[PDB]
């Protein structure tokens, strides 16, 4: 699904 620090952190913020 969606990660906390792996989706919006170290990769890109939405």
PDB file of N, CA and C in Angstrom:
ATOM      1  N   UNK A   1       0.827  -1.238   0.000  1.00  0.00           N
ATOM      2  CA  UNK A   1       0.000   0.000   0.000  1.00  0.00           C
ATOM      3  C   UNK A   1       0.843   1.261   0.000  1.00  0.00           C
ATOM      4  N   UNK A   2       0.776   2.011   1.105  1.00  0.00           N
ATOM      5  CA  UNK A   2       1.533   3.254   1.249  1.00  0.00           C
ATOM      6  C   UNK A   2       2.345   3.241   2.545  1.00  0.00           C
ATOM      7  N   UNK A   3       3.615   3.644   2.441  1.00  0.00           N
ATOM      8  CA  UNK A   3       4.523   3.688   3.591  1.00  0.00           C
ATOM      9  C   UNK A   3       4.597   5.095   4.186  1.00  0.00           C
ATOM     10  N   UNK A   4       5.084   5.181   5.430  1.00  0.00           N
ATOM     11  CA  UNK A   4       5.186   6.453   6.154  1.00  0.00           C
ATOM     12  C   UNK A   4       6.471   7.226   5.830  1.00  0.00           C
ATOM     13  N   UNK A   5       7.591   6.547   5.987  1.00  0.00           N
ATOM     14  CA  UNK A   5       8.918   7.129   5.743  1.00  0.00           C
ATOM     15  C   UNK A   5       9.546   6.630   4.434  1.00  0.00           C
ATOM     16  N   UNK A   6       8.921   5.626   3.815  1.00  0.00           N
ATOM     17  CA  UNK A   6       9.429   5.048   2.571  1.00  0.00           C
ATOM     18  C   UNK A   6       8.682   5.574   1.341  1.00  0.00           C
ATOM     19  N   UNK A   7       7.551   6.244   1.573  1.00  0.00           N
ATOM     20  CA  UNK A   7       6.736   6.796   0.489  1.00  0.00           C
ATOM     21  C   UNK A   7       6.880   8.316   0.378  1.00  0.00           C
ATOM     22  N   UNK A   8       6.819   9.005   1.527  1.00  0.00           N
ATOM     23  CA  UNK A   8       6.928  10.461   1.545  1.00  0.00           C
ATOM     24  C   UNK A   8       8.271  10.972   2.042  1.00  0.00           C
ATOM     25  N   UNK A   9       9.177  10.053   2.399  1.00  0.00           N
ATOM     26  CA  UNK A   9      10.500  10.426   2.900  1.00  0.00           C
ATOM     27  C   UNK A   9      11.601   9.655   2.181  1.00  0.00           C
ATOM     28  N   UNK A  10      12.729  10.354   1.914  1.00  0.00           N
ATOM     29  CA  UNK A  10      13.916   9.792   1.219  1.00  0.00           C
ATOM     30  C   UNK A  10      13.638   9.444  -0.258  1.00  0.00           C
ATOM     31  N   UNK A  11      12.400   9.687  -0.709  1.00  0.00           N
ATOM     32  CA  UNK A  11      11.999   9.409  -2.091  1.00  0.00           C
ATOM     33  C   UNK A  11      11.265  10.601  -2.709  1.00  0.00           C
ATOM     34  N   UNK A  12      10.372  11.218  -1.925  1.00  0.00           N
ATOM     35  CA  UNK A  12       9.610  12.365  -2.400  1.00  0.00           C
ATOM     36  C   UNK A  12       8.348  12.598  -1.593  1.00  0.00           C
ATOM     37  N   UNK A  13       7.985  13.875  -1.427  1.00  0.00           N
ATOM     38  CA  UNK A  13       6.791  14.257  -0.671  1.00  0.00           C
ATOM     39  C   UNK A  13       5.632  14.575  -1.610  1.00  0.00           C
ATOM     40  N   UNK A  14       4.418  14.220  -1.181  1.00  0.00           N
ATOM     41  CA  UNK A  14       3.207  14.461  -1.971  1.00  0.00           C
ATOM     42  C   UNK A  14       2.465  15.703  -1.472  1.00  0.00           C
TER      43      UNK A  14
END
